[PDB]
Amino acid sequence: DPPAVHLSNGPGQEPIAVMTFDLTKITKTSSSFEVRTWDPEGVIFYGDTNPKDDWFMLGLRDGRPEIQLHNHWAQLTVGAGPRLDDGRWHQVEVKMEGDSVLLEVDGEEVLRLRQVSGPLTSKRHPIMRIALGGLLFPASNLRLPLVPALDGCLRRDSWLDKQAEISASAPTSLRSC
Amino acid sequence: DPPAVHLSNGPGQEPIAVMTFDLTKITKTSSSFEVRTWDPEGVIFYGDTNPKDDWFMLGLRDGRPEIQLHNHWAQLTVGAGPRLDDGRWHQVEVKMEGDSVLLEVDGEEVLRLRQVSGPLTSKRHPIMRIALGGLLFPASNLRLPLVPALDGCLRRDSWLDKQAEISASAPTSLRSC
Ligand SMILES: C[C@]12CCC(=O)C[C@@H]1CC[C@@H]1[C@@H]2CC[C@]2(C)[C@@H](O)CC[C@@H]12
Ligand SMILES: C[C@]12CCC(=O)C[C@@H]1CC[C@@H]1[C@@H]2CC[C@]2(C)[C@@H](O)CC[C@@H]12
């Protein structure tokens, strides 16, 4: 695994890494990574501009991707795609195209959430945070709670536009797989 | 094709068949059929209790399933699953399990819409209409318009609970494939 990190360190409460982005600079509105796990439930990543009313989470529930999103346009809890909890490395891409959010798993589009978002460079609070392996609000506050810690590995990740990233923080040291 | 019917007769404005169901009798809250088409866009079926604010549509957009749903709990436009416009027969099942609506394509769950519905036998207007191959309101009134007529075939269909069906109507004669 090209430098692979564990998505949760121990209890799986908080994220392993939080990155902050300036939306006025953002061009690339997509993210991509490889994930490996035997765990059927947990958070893969979370993103927000506001943890009360403009947020997004991607995780697994019953082995399969689940997206939760709450913003001015849309509030939803959706599962889609094949199980990913077979301990093999899977390529995932989450992209915003027009007003849609698309999820691709192993080269195939498995979900398209249409009419869920107005442009990034036009939007309100112009800072976006991306949290890897945990949420930035309690799990009990999701639309549909899940147990946050995902026991899996993450590698070959790229988050939004690196030229728009303002800062990156880890709350502890990141362990390798 | 065990008695297969065309999903649109000519212009594709109106449905080929409309069935009406008594929700106080409903037990089976699922529907299933096989579909065949080369057409990448159109309506497969529509259902409602109220065409202003409690309705559902399943069709194809860009070859792939798309669900549109508008009710008291949820308003959404979602694409998911593989392309079905390869002129092969595909098995589709749409089921309500708890508060979710699940779509299965060729034996695989490809979409789970969670937290979208309160029970049927508990719900408001206790008549549900299911329209095959068209809508019961203009297409321009969908959340996201599509051209309604789907040029495909439908066979081996079963809609909700036949012991709860109150009446069935066709606006013209149904043609075979
Ligand atoms: C999925 C996106 C866009 C695609 C991506 O790379 C990740 C990122 C996660 C945060 C989401 C964002 C789309 C727009 C959302 C949903 C905002 O409304 C609030 C959080 C944002
Ligand atoms: C998908 C369901 C439930 C499953 C099925 O067999 C078809 C049917 C189509 C009408 C939908 C219904 C679920 C509940 C909905 C979405 C109601 O709120 C209004 C229309 C109903």
Residues with Cβ within 8 Å of B142's Cβ and at least 6 positions away in sequence, in order, are B57, B68, B135
Token code pair at residue B96: 């309500």
Asked if B97 is an interface residue toward chain A (Cβ–Cβ < 8 A), one would say no
**Residues A117 and A101: beta-carbon distance below 8 Å:** yes
Cα B118 to Cα B111: distance, rounded to the nearest angstrom: 18
> Which of A76, A77, A114 lies nearest to residue B79, judging by beta carbons?
A114
Contacts of A64 in chain B (CB under 8 A): 109, 112
Residue B125 DSSP code: S
Cα A69 to Cα A101: distance, rounded to the nearest angstrom: 10
Residue A139 phi, psi (nearest 5): -65, -30
Residue A118 DSSP code: -
Residue B25, classed as helix, strand or coil, is: coil
CATH 3.40.50.300 fits A1-177, yes or no: no
Distances (CA, A) of A95 to A101, A117, A167: 6, 12, 21
* Ligand 2 binding site (Cβ under 6 Å of any ligand atom): B 29-31, 47-49, 54-56, 69, 71, 94-96, 101, 117, 160
**Residues A25 and A88: beta-carbon distance below 8 Å:** no
Burial of A11 (0-12, 13-18, 19+ CB in 10 A): exposed
Cβ A113–B78 below 8 Å, yes or no? Answer: yes
Cα A60 to Cα A98: distance, rounded to the nearest angstrom: 25
- Facing residues of B127 across strands? B22
Ligand 2 centroid to residue B120 C-alpha, Å: 9
**Closest residue in chain A to residue B113, using alpha carbons only:** A78
Q: Strand B90-97 and strand A42-50: pairing?
A: unpaired
Helix (H) or strand (E) holding B65: strand B64-70
Distances (CA, A) of B158 to A173, B105, B155: 56, 15, 9
Contacts of A109 in chain B (CB under 8 A): 64, 79
Cα A109 to Cα A122: distance, rounded to the nearest angstrom: 27
Q: Provide the terminal-to-terminal Cα distance of chain B, rounded to the nearest Å.
A: 8
Which of B56, B71, B73, B142 has most ligand 2 atoms within 8 Å of CB, for mutation? B56
Cα A31 to Cα A126: distance, rounded to the nearest angstrom: 18
The runs of H, that is alpha helices, within A115-162 are none
**Residues B112 and B100: beta-carbon distance below 8 Å:** yes
Contacts of A66 in chain B (CB under 8 A): 114
Q: Give the other-Cβ count within 10 Å of A81's Cβ.
A: 26
Residue B164 DSSP code: G
Rg (CA), chain B: 15
In chain B, where the domains are located: 1-177
CA dihedral of B11, B84, A64, B29, whole degrees rounded to 10:
50
How far does CA A143 lie from the centroid of its chain?
Answer: 16
**Residues A37 and A86: beta-carbon distance below 8 Å:** no
Q: Which amino acid type is present at position A16?
A: I
Token code pair at residue A169: 């923080």
